[PDB]
Amino acid sequence: MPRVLVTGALGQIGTDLSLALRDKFGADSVLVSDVVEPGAKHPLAGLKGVEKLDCLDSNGFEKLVKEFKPTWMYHLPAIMSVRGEAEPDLAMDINVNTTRYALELARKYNIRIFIPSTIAAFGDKCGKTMTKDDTIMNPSTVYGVTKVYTELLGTWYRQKYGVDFRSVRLPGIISAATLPGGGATDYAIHMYHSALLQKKCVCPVLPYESLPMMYMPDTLNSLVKIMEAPLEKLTRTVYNITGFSFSPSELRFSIERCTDRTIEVEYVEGPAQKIANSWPDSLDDSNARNDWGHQVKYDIDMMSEDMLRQIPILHGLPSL
Amino acid sequence: MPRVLVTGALGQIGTDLSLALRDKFGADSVLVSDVVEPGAKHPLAGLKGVEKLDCLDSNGFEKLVKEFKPTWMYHLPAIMSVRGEAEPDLAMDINVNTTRYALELARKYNIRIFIPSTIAAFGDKCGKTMTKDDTIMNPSTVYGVTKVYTELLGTWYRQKYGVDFRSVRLPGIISAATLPGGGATDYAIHMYHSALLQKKCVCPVLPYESLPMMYMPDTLNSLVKIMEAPLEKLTRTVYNITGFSFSPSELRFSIERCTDRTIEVEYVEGPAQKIANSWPDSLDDSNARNDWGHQVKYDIDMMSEDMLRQIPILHGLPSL
Ligand SMILES: NC(=O)c1ccc[n+]([C@@H]2O[C@H](COP(=O)([O-])OP(=O)(O)OC[C@H]3O[C@@H](n4cnc5c(N)ncnc54)[C@H](O)[C@@H]3O)[C@@H](O)[C@H]2O)c1
Ligand SMILES: NC(=O)c1ccc[n+]([C@@H]2O[C@H](COP(=O)([O-])OP(=O)(O)OC[C@H]3O[C@@H](n4cnc5c(N)ncnc54)[C@H](O)[C@@H]3O)[C@@H](O)[C@H]2O)c1
Ligand code: NA
Ligand code: NA
């Protein structure tokens, strides 16, 4: 049974992942860290086994790994697609350096290490329908560029040192618990909050711009499952996974079907649009399905029903 | 006349490039720098406009740029294929960080910036025969990884900030003046030394491992030409260029025709071999030929002739 370290643990993925790992392997077997502390409303506030770590401090990062002695690590800090364009130096610092430190520690301390990649690693030469695991990588964002680096450096650590590096290219991830951290797909979570607040949604992504997406439970299931898999079953280090593709107008219809009313959305292009338009419309994840059993239980309407219930509960919004 | 800065100038490529730039544009229009000073026999010893600069010192780098006000920069420092595998920390520090500082200075000070990439950016999924400009990039060395990162980051600077970033993927470069710095293609220059010394060459690359190569004068012609080109002629930022491909056994034959004697070569595999076996056999450089007129004068025997003539002259070895 693993000892699991999670870095960048208090963001959107880390929040749900930390809780899932604690529930599955026990609180004692999981250490959760982040450069900031949980806010008093955060789901991890008050819990033991939650520490402060700046992953840019390699010596600090090493210290924490030395005492906890993880056998697995999920390294989650990164600056994402939209925010990276506005804060590229921070993106380059975090996405490149913390990753290098994390891999070097996985090597030194024999840790199975997960570092998520992203559909943002792709650009407009990727082949955009059912994009393959191996294709041309020409990302149009610095974030995407740093993630191509992460995939390649991770794979080199595997080849060179036998570090058990594992990764998935995550689509847009939808969840209710922690608000998203500045990717091009953040509109989707915000459209649900707008609909519950009964306010105008100003959606920065164009109405028919379809993207690969996934609801958090399927994401967590796959994050754990790829890490539990035997090394010998994995034919590669980095795997596309997807849940289902949708455009904003499809998301809108879902919400309207579940709320049984119209919601108002104005499509005014923001920076997310040119970025999203460069990305795949859908991914081929057959390698992941075949090698380690990636699977998808939610569709858009099951997601919408769950989001519409969970947001009022977790954030105190009005409900249906 | 451009004002040209060359960083990492005392190495194999920098040595001849610095001399060619000084001849073409005038010594007063060219400033070159390196982390070390030239030795008394270095061809740039004793010359004006040769400075000591560590490109990891971003302050120092910026001070030199600000004083000189280059309009062009050739940013050459990197730790190469073989040496990188043995010193990967240095490779990551140099190849990533000096490149980031270079691109930022090109943005900040309006410099057309050349940073070479390499055939080592490719690995074994590239399509090994006549490799295309756009293909799967899966390098198996940390050096190659850092160069994919260099191509993509430079390209992003071009898109995001209008930075005029230009690159070629260089094949193995052959020259006589300054000895090579630890690439997988270094055997070739050393075989010419062995021949003139009439000493046994122990060759770490296997006899039929064919690689893209180019002789220096063609390389210099292309390095200036791609930089003279008008921006609007360039359909891309990164170009394959090649001279011709050869294996060690072909090189040996070529040296033997020119010397009219047997060289003794023993094949004892070293790290260079596995590295080189993941690379293309040959490149497609049509985009370069078409966009900016990349062209090649030498073939293997002209190269060998010129190498065997110049090495005695340049290094005091025994002639023919
Ligand atoms: N959410 C998505 O839809 C999505 C999609 C594809 C990939 N990803 C990837 O998943 C990972 C996490 O994404 P997220 O949505 O949870 O992001 P987020 O922005 O919600 O969370 C990032 C967390 O990292 C922390 N962090 C920042 N700098 C740090 C440092 N120096 N040291 C330690 N922690 C630091 C932040 O405080 C924050 O809690 C990233 O690698 C991201 O690229 C996310
Ligand atoms: N020679 C080849 O066959 C070849 C092939 C493909 C690509 N390249 C690329 O061409 C460039 C130059 O290659 P080269 O063969 O001349 O390399 P080299 O090792 O011969 O020379 C590199 C020079 O850079 C200097 N340097 C190292 N660290 C530095 C620092 N921190 N600051 C300033 N200078 C520093 C070294 O002192 C040396 O003079 C590199 O980017 C390399 O990857 C070379
Ligand atoms: Na799309
Ligand atoms: Na070859």
Q: CA B194, CA B318: separation in Å to the nearest integer?
A: 11
Q: Is the dihedral of CA B118, B122, B127, B128 positive or negative?
A: positive
Q: How far apart are the first and last CA of chain A?
A: 42
What are B134-140's contacts with CB under 8 Å, separation 24+? B134/A125, B134/A136, B134/A138, B135/A136, B136/A134, B136/A135, B136/A136, B137/A136, B137/A137, B137/A152, B138/A134, B138/A152, B138/A155, B139/A152, B139/A156, B139/B278, B140/A156, B140/A159, B140/B274, B140/B275, B140/B278
Token pair belonging to A50: 């939650």
Distance from the alpha carbon of residue A59 to the mean position of ligand 2, in angstroms? 30
Q: CA A29, CA A14: separation in Å to the nearest integer?
A: 16
Residue B280 and residue B131 in contact, taking contact as beta carbons nearer than 8 Å: yes
Distance from CA of B73 to the nearest CA of A (A): 22
Q: CA A210, CA B34: separation in Å to the nearest integer?
A: 50
- Residues spanned by the domain of B28: 1-320
Resolution in A: 2.1
Rounded alpha-carbon distances, angstroms, from residue A57 to A95, A100, B293: 14, 12, 48
Window 176-195 of A, Cβ < 8 Å to B: none
Phi and psi torsions of A40, nearest 5°: -55, -30
Residue A294 and residue A239 in contact, taking contact as beta carbons nearer than 8 Å: yes
Distance from the alpha carbon of residue B282 to the mean position of ligand 4, in angstroms? 8
What are A120-126's contacts with CB under 8 Å, separation 24+? A120/A80, A120/A81, A120/A144, A120/A147, A120/A183, A120/A184, A120/A275, A120/A279, A121/A147, A121/A148, A121/A151, A121/A169, A122/A169, A122/A278, A122/A279, A122/A280, A123/A278, A123/A279, A124/A278, A125/B134, A126/A279, A126/A280
Give the ligand whose atoms come closest to the C-alpha of residue A283: 3
**Active-site hit among B143, B157, B187, B298:** B143
Q: CA B311, CA B192: separation in Å to the nearest integer?
A: 8
Judge whether B137 is closer than 8 Å to chain A, CB to CB.
yes
Q: Left (φ > 0), alpha (ψ -120 to 50) or beta: where does B69 sit? A: left
Residue nearest to atom 38 of ligand 1 (CA): A11
B123-136 burial: b if 16+ Cβ within 10 Å, else e:
beebebeebbbebb
Q: CA A32, CA A258: separation in Å to the nearest integer?
A: 35
User: Do the Cβ atoms of B137 and A141 come within 8 Å?
Assistant: no
HSE at residue A301, side-chain half, CA atoms within 13 A, is 6
Judge whether B126 is closer than 8 Å to chain A, CB to CB.
no
Residue A272 and residue A225 in contact, taking contact as beta carbons nearer than 8 Å: no
Q: CA B308, CA B196: separation in Å to the nearest integer?
A: 7
Nearest to A118 by CA among A260, A253, A239: A239
Q: Choose among A140, A141, A153: nearest Cβ to B145.
A: A153
Angle between helix B216-228 and helix B12-25 axes, rounded to 10 deg:
60
Judge whether B198 is closer than 8 Å to chain A, CB to CB.
no
Judge whether A134 is closer than 8 Å to chain B, CB to CB.
yes
Establish whether A143 is a catalytic residue.
yes
Judge whether A145 is closer than 8 Å to chain B, CB to CB.
yes
> What is the distance, to the nearest Å, from the Cα of residue B239 to the centroid of all Cα atoms in its chain?
14
Phi and psi torsions of B125, nearest 5°: -100, 10
Q: Which atom of ligand 1 is nearest to the CA of A119?
A: 6
Q: Helix, strand, or coil here: A10?
A: coil
User: Do the Cβ atoms of B148 and A153 come within 8 Å?
Assistant: no
Rounded alpha-carbon distances, angstroms, from residue A302 to A64, A176, A223, A308, A317: 40, 14, 20, 10, 20
Collect all residues of chain B within an 8 Å Cβ-Cβ radius of residue A142: 153, 156, 160
Distance from the alpha carbon of residue A289 to the mean position of ligand 3, in angstroms? 23
Distance from CA of B19 to the nearest CA of A (A): 35
Nearest residue on chain A to B158, alpha-carbon basis: A140
What are A195-198's contacts with CB under 8 Å, separation 24+? A195/A255, A195/A259, A195/A263, A195/A308, A196/A308, A196/A311, A196/A312, A196/A317, A196/A318, A196/A319, A196/A320, A197/A317, A197/A318, A198/A263, A198/A318
Judge whether A48 is closer than 8 Å to chain B, CB to CB.
no
Collect all residues of chain A within an 8 Å Cβ-Cβ radius of residue B137: 136-137, 152
Nearest to A219 by CA among A251, A198, A242, A250: A242
Q: Which atom of ligand 1 is nearest to the CA of A93?
A: 31
- Write the DSSP symbol of residue A208: T
> CA angle B214-B132-B233, nearest 5°?
80
Residue A143 and residue A80 in contact, taking contact as beta carbons nearer than 8 Å: yes
Mapping DSSP onto H, E and C, the string for chain B reads CCCEEEECCCCHHHHHHHHHHHHHHCHHHEEEEECCCCCCCCCCCCCCCEEECCCCCHHHHHHHHHHHCCCEEEECCCCCHHHHHHCHHHHHHHHHHHHHHHHHHHHHHCCEEECCEEHHHCCCCCCCCCECCCCCCCCCCHHHHHHHHHHHHHHHHHHHHCCCEEEEEECEEECCCCCCCCCCCCHHHHHHHHHHHCCCEEECCCCCCCEEEEEHHHHHHHHHHHHHCCHHHCCCCEEECCCEEECHHHHHHHHHHHHCCCCCEEECCCHHHHHHHCCCCCECCHHHHHHHCCCCCCCHHHHHHHHHHHHHHHHCCCCC
Residue nearest to atom 12 of ligand 2 (CA): B76
Q: CA A143, CA A133: separation in Å to the nearest integer?
A: 19
CATH code of the domain containing B210 = 3.40.50.720
Residue nearest to atom 1 of ligand 2 (CA): B173
Residue nearest to atom 7 of ligand 1 (CA): A118
Number of residues written out for chain B: 320
Q: Which atom of ligand 2 is nearest to the CA of B98?
A: 31
Q: Choose among B100, B137, B159: nearest Cβ to A137.
A: B137
Work out how many domains chain A is built from and give that number: 1
Q: CA B254, CA B304: separation in Å to the nearest integer?
A: 7
Rounded alpha-carbon distances, angstroms, from residue B224 to B50, B219, B240, B314: 20, 9, 15, 24
User: Do the Cβ atoms of A148 and B148 come within 8 Å?
Assistant: yes
